[PDB]
Design a protein around this nucleic acid. Structure first.
Lengths: 215, 64, 136, 107
RNA sequence: CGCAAGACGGACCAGAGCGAAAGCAUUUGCCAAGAAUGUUUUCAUUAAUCAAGAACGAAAGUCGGAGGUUCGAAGACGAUCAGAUACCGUCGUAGUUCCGACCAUAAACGAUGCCGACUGGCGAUGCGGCGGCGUUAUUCCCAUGACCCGCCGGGCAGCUUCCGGGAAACCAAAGUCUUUGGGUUCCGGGGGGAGUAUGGUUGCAAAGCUGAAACUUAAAGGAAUUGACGGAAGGGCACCACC
RNA sequence: CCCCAUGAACGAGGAAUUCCCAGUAAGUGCGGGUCAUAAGCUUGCGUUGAUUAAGUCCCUGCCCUUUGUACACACCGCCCG
């Protein structure tokens, strides 16, 4: 029986990104008018938006995505925090080519602020120009030592430094380059990225750091 | 979403499709602006220089 | 109706989300969080015949009925996640998925990024119905 | 009388390999046997990009791809002319080919 | 958006690897094991291949639990058909998965015993060793490392060849077979009756091994060649075809 | 055959299906064959004269390669309880 079309009731908030990113005005989102029987901030607070790092930086960051999760609300403002980085589908699919070895290593590590992260890396062998084998695999010995190197760096590079510096780090892709330096002594490698980061455990609350990062 | 009507002039007659062989391929100079040029399928008998009246004006077919 | 804000420049943003399978085509904008909907409509509802559930023309009609209320409630713009049946299912796009995208862009909403989100599985759960294949 | 010296498709040094499921019959065929065709295509397609480029914000952007590696069992890949009977002689040619790389102005 | 269960290890992944074969792709650790190579180490004939005996042995099935996510041998359903107990849709079973026992069979095909020698060209690739006043990657030079080129073993193979083989298809082994003789082991003697009867044996069971006859019958069969013909693929041609 | 009278169905044809590209389709009369008599026929001929593909292999039919075949009295063939 005709009733309550719902937008004509809904309220708007402006999604705000952390400081390390560049521009910070992500877009807008709608919730229901708060009623005592309700907390529009409730239906608002653990929401996560996934935005492209390119929109976030402005660029070459076509591939790469960041998951931004709403951590608190202040009048039409909602302050989000790092929740993850993935790659998309197209980019990842495009690296994976036959005749080359695909190498993956991932490590789970606690940051300086508590956060527990599982953080993945990836690489592919490279034929080097005057090669004339068509393929370019690596040996099992190689990959085992390469993986150890990737893993050592990723734990080394996340142990020291908080969620923010990992972020500050993943933007100019300094890990990538560091891997490249530690591995060329062992075997070629084309590509190379920390390709995903997964938030496993969150520390408790603290608006302090959140605001430090926003505001 | 949409409406307009488009005049287009035959540049080059491609060949014939339809398994029956009754639709003629055509290339069209876009009449109102020459800096356009597209492939359209025809019902009738068509010869160079005469004009189509395109509804769809994107689309651009092929076989069928 | 309504609008997040006057914005003679940037556009209020939502998520487009199209599932194209064969035998239908879902179009779907939601709030960039996802938790809250906004105007759905499928390629089914706008034709009758079951056989024609999934045809691009129906798909157009659906993206048109959708874009309407999209620009009628507040979304000025939308980022799209196209999908297939996925799972062990086919893994290829259904026919009126393209048609829906052409219909909304043409409609005159705004576009932003794209990824595919069909669920591809580090394979298993045996695919349906048996070893000798659908024979037909 | 034995037809292909390769029998089905290349094994030689095994006796076994896991089987895949046809992407059409949902059949079942060893992975050594089975026609495989990669499939990379733009999210948008032919006509769209122009409305897709105009309607979008962003200054260019610049289109994702969907990537899908297909598998067919023999009967499907024949049926649908993925592959086509080749004379007693032509069968021997593993190679591959066409003349331009059909990407817009092909058949 | 989170979470639980059970399943499975995609893309990367190959005429590529290993393993006696059956078979075997997530990480990491432990445990022993296996080949190749290198090797102016050790023994001095230790050795080749095998009745009997024995180890392993995909799948289904069977015994008892765990478990059943997924899919599903049976059944019940909806369609289709002249008939449909089917294919096709749906619901869905034992079962799939896992543990401890059975069972001993698969076009378990490379349909090709195993071991040794000899007879022919080229380029790949896994791997080991060896050589280069060759490339690129670094520091102050390095030790590195990955490559290019060559050489040699032993892998799985490929390619081209009037050696030669074969009925041919084919085959560098199916060669070195009437000019018939390197070692050893196994099975077959027209086709059906038949892996059947019967006794023995193994099995909880389902079944497995060994394995006849009476009678039946003049071809069974192989290979190549050619049409005819196809609801196989590219083909055409004609208003006795369409448009 | 005529003359009168009696003055039917049929008011556009389902499933199907023939034939046809230029003096062609179609309307329209004539002459020849049969013939004693007998044209609704066949068999030409002129007259009046369009619509419409201008091609293609979809269906159909037949020949063209390649391919499969337990067929070869050749698919109208060779089959199970």
């Amino acid at each position: 029986k005709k009733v309550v079309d719902p937008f004509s009731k809904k309220d708007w908030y402006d999604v705000k990104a952390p400081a390390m990113f560049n521009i910070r005005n992500i877009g807008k989102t709608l919730v229901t008018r708060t009623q005592g029987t309700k907390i529009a901030s409730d239906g608002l607070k653990g929401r996560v938006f996934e935005v492209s790092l390119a929109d976030l930086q402005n660029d070459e960051v076509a591939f790469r995505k960041f998951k931004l999760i709403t951590e608190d609300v202040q009048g039409k403002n909602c302050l989000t925090n790092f929740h993850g980085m993935d790659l998309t589908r197209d980019k990842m699919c495009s690296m994976v080519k036959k005749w080359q070895t695909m190498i993956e290593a991932h490590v789970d590590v606690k940051t300086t602020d508590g956060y527990l992260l599982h953080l993945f890396c990836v690489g592919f062998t490279k034929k080097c120009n005057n090669q004339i084998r068509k393929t370019s695999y690596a040996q099992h010995q190689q990959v085992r030592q390469i993986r150890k190197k990737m893993m050592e760096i990723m734990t080394r590079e996340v142990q020291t430094n908080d969620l923010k510096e990992v972020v500050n780090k993943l933007i100019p892709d300094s890990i990538g380059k560091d891997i490249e330096k530690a591995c060329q002594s062992i075997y070629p490698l084309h590509d190379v990225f920390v390709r995903k980061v997964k938030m496993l455990k969150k520390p408790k609350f603290e608006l302090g750091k959140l605001m430090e990062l926003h505001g | 979403r949409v409406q307009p009507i488009k005049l287009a002039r035959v540049t080059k007659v491609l060949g014939r499709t339809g398994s029956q062989g009754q639709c003629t391929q055509v290339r069209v100079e876009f009449m109102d602006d020459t800096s356009r040029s597209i492939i359209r399928n025809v019902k009738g008998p068509v010869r160079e220089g005469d004009v189509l009246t395109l509804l769809e004006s994107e689309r651009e077919a092929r076989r069928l | 109706s309504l609008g997040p804000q006057v914005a003679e420049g940037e556009n209020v943003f939502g998520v487009c989300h199209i599932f194209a399978s064969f035998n239908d085509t879902f179009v779907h904008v939601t709030d960039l969080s996802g938790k809250e909907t906004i105007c759905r409509v499928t390629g089914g509802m706008k034709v009758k015949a079951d056989r024609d559930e999934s045809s691009p023309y129906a798909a157009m009609l659906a993206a048109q009925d959708v874009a309407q209320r999209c620009k009628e409630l507040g979304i000025t713009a939308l980022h799209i996640k196209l999908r297939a049946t996925g799972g062990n299912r086919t893994k290829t796009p259904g026919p009126g998925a393209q048609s829906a995208l052409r219909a909304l862009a043409r409609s005159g909403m705004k576009i932003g990024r794209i990824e595919d989100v069909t669920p591809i599985p580090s394979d298993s759960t045996r695919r349906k119905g048996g070893r000798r294949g659908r024979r037909l | 009388t034995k037809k292909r010296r390769n029998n089905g498709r290349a094994k030689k040094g095994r006796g076994h390999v896991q089987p895949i499921r046809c992407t059409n019959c949902a059949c079942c065929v060893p992975k050594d046997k089975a026609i495989k065709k990669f499939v990379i295509r733009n999210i948008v397609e032919a006509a769209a990009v122009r409305d897709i480029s105009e309607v979008s914000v962003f200054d260019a952007y610049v289109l994702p791809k969907l990537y899908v590696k297909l598998h067919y069992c023999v009967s499907c890949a024949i049926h649908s002319k993925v592959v086509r009977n080749r004379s007693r002689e032509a069968r021997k040619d593993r190679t591959p080919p066409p003349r331009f790389r059909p990407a817009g102005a092909a058949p």
